Design a protein around this ligand. Structure first.
Ligand code: NAG
Ligand code: NGA
Ligand code: FUC
Ligand code: CA
Length: 127
């Protein structure tokens, strides 16, 4: 058995199948067995509910620590955004795309340029 497919410490026999110890269940001994008091015990919703991600990000379960805290998810950001929660509109003016003294304005996944006189072009690249 490739080294352990089974989480929670279930023993694996061969493609592969896992003997689940007392309290665990498929898939790969990752799930829950219960009795009466378990229901009426408060459920936690997932790390993705409610959605932690802003700006249209996609929350995904992952092996993720912020510092020494296991947060168990990451946010997949759309073009133009970043940050742990996708909270940041990326500043596309940081890398100074407007040349020859042009002034950059920031847009979602884009920028535009106002050109000092006699310079022209999308990037002010032309004199
Ligand atoms: C916005 O970004 C797209 C993608 O690069 C680009 O083709 C387009 O020129 C931009 N829109 C503007 C500012 O005209
Ligand atoms: C888990 O907790 C949330 C918080 O209110 C909801 O009550 C949810 O309904 C619970 N889980 C289940 C079993 O639906
Ligand atoms: C998850 O990924 C992010 C980046 C967006 O594409 C969402 O539409 C999708 O659900
Ligand atoms: Ca931007």
């Amino acid at each position: 058995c490739d080294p352990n497919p089974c989480e929670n410490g279930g023993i694996c026999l061969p493609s592969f199948s896992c003997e689940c110890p007392d309290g665990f269940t498929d898939p790969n001994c990752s799930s829950v067995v219960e009795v009466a008091s378990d229901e009426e015990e408060p459920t936690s919703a997932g790390p993705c509910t409610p959605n932690p991600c802003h700006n249209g990000g996609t929350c995904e379960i992952s092996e993720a620590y912020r510092g020494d805290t296991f947060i168990g998810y990451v946010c997949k950001c759309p073009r133009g955004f970043n940050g742990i929660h996708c909270q940041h509109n990326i500043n596309e003016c940081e890398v100074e795309p407007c040349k020859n003294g042009g002034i950059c304005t920031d847009l979602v996944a884009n920028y535009s340029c106002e050109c000092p006189g006699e310079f022209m072009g999308r990037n002010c690249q032309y004199k």
